[PDB]
Design a protein around this ligand. Structure first.
Ligand SMILES: COc1cccc([C@@H](N)CO)c1
Lengths: 300, 237
């Protein structure tokens, strides 16, 4: 079990760690978060009490270094840093743990939620989507645009998701215009899976990372990406059986976790009714469809 | 974006454009089978592709053999339209390709956009106008050429005959739609109106009769009376 210590909390803020969040009061004696399950990628994210504008936060893997949070009062935010002196980080973290100034990552032992939400998420990929190579963690916020959103302005602060466009030459083979627009299999299997992602695990990971940035940061371009990568499978008449079965598991947990009160902005009515009721895969997502009908029958 | 009554004069500017109407591409007759079930027998169609500036009609004849062995024909029809329009653009020299293509039905937007991805600079647009191009097959020579066709065939017409010698294209277009609207609302009466006077002939190289300007006025008025009429006979007013 690993630890994200905090030098202080000078400004009141709601901290999130994965699907958990807690309130810190301005200058409350808080020094961080302990007991973080090794082996997953995590997100620690912030919403200042005073300006709910801009949720932001950091993707990290504890296996990839010793990471602390320190508020910068020039830039006005909680920033993630790395301490390379490992001796020093052990002794700093021990002192705060002896003084019990850290909250504990409160994982219930029956609860696989975080795993089912980050199964294919890998830090190495997150760092290619979020380009800032001198750090081992990756910063996101609600307002970062995606590479595709910049085609339709700062390229350094973008989300370099894979571009998916159903009306592109990439997506449509000369001579198979009607075939390839109505059944996107060629684009799913040959172009994206075989060509760009190499395998379905890289694809689901981007899909899951997309989804989590929409949920945690209300990042609109990630929501667009999450929906597109769903629609691209659901609109392919030929999908490996194991991908469908995994897709039904992935989404189901995404729908279960989603705040009940945020569905109106995070869920695209059109994509979801199409995917569950019209598309080639309308009968292949039993779990996702049963949860969606029972939690959000309004959208449908 | 979409084309409507406000930007109506843009049809006649010097930016090349084409209307595409796909309503006559897939045509059937529905009939009873010996077993008392119902079946369709398709008949030849045409794509109605028109430069409203010049009157040039590229009438692509769709022989029934293109439907042989195919399913979901009404959908395929829109894709077939798009493919043919796109082949028409590619065959025209560059300075002749359109800068816009207006589709008279929104369902053709996506098929044509997908077939014209190679032409990103060509604006594919819908329209709010209720254009009567569907009545094109009420023009005898056009109908005749579709129904006689034994193979796929493209035929070039000037839908305005020689009107542009005497009137502008705005007025030509407006005369055309008024004739087509009349043919569409009451084909017989419309056709009766156009030919009542045997001394007014249709030149071999034209589609419509050789009316004087004064006679077109009289003709145009009778077509309005007809359209207003059938609007009463229809709504009882
Ligand atoms: C609060 O956690 C840590 C961790 C490592 C080093 C330090 C120092 N930069 C003091 O702020 C603090």
């Amino acid at each position: 079990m690993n630890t994200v210590p905090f030098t202080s909390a000078p400004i009141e803020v709601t901290i999130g760690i994965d699907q958990y969040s807690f309130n810190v009061k301005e200058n409350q004696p808080f020094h961080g978060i302990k007991d973080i399950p090794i082996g997953h990628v995590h997100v620690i994210h912030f919403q200042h009490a005073d300006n709910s504008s801009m949720r932001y936060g950091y993707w990290f893997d504890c296996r990839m270094g010793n990471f602390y949070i320190q508020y910068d009062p020039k830039d006005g935010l909680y920033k993630m840093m790395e301490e390379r002196d490992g001796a020093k980080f052990e002794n700093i973290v021990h002192n705060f743990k002896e003084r019990q100034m850290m909250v504990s990552y409160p994982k219930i032992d029956e609860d696989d939620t975080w795993y089912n939400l980050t199964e294919f998420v890998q830090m190495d990929k997150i760092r290619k989507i979020v380009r800032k190579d001198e750090n081992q963690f990756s910063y996101v916020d609600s307002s970062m645009t995606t590479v595709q959103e910049n085609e339709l302005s700062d390229p350094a602060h973008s989300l370099n998701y894979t571009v998916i466009n159903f009306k592109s030459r990439e997506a449509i083979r000369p001579g198979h215009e009607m075939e390839d627009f109505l059944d996107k299999s060629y684009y799913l299997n040959t172009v994206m899976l075989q060509g760009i992602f190499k395998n379905s695990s890289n694809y689901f990971g981007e899909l899951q990372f997309a989804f989590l940035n929409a949920m945690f940061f209300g990042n609109y371009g990630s929501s667009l990406q999450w929906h597109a990568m769903i629609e691209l499978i659901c609109s392919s008449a030929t999908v490996p059986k194991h991908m469908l079965d995994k897709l039904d598991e992935i989404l189901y947990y995404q729908i279960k976790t989603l705040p009940e009160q945020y569905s109106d902005i995070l869920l695209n009515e059109r994509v979801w009714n199409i995917c569950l009721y019209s598309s080639f895969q309308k009968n292949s997502l039993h779990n996702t469809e049963k949860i969606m009908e029972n939690k959000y029958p309004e959208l449908l | 974006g979409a084309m409507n009554s406000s930007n109506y004069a843009e049809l006649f500017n010097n930016d090349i454009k084409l209307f595409v109407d796909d309503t006559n591409v897939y045509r059937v007759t529905v009939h009873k089978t010996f077993e008392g079930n119902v079946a369709t027998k398709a008949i030849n169609g045409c794509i109605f592709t028109l430069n409203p500036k010049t009157g040039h009609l590229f009438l692509k004849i769709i022989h029934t053999s293109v439907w042989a062995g195919q399913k979901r024909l009404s959908q395929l029809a829109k894709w077939k339209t798009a493919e043919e329009v796109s082949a028409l653009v590619r065959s025209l020299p560059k300075e002749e390709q359109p800068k816009q293509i207006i589709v008279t039905r929104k369902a053709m937007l996506d098929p044509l956009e997908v077939h014209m991805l190679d032409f990103p600079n060509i604006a594919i647009r819908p329209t709010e106008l209720r254009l009567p191009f569907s009545a094109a097959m009420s023009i005898d020579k056009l109908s005749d050429v579709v129904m006689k066709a034994t193979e796929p065939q493209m035929v070039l017409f000037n839908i305005y005959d020689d009107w542009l010698d005497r009137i502008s294209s705005y007025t030509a277009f407006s005369r055309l739609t008024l004739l087509l609207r009349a043919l569409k609302t009451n084909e017989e009466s419309a056709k009766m109106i156009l030919l009542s006077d045997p001394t007014i002939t249709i030149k071999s190289y034209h589609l419509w009769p050789s009316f004087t300007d004064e006679q077109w006025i009289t003709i145009e008025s009778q077509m309005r009376d007809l359209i207003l009429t059938e609007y009463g006979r229809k709504y009882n007013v």
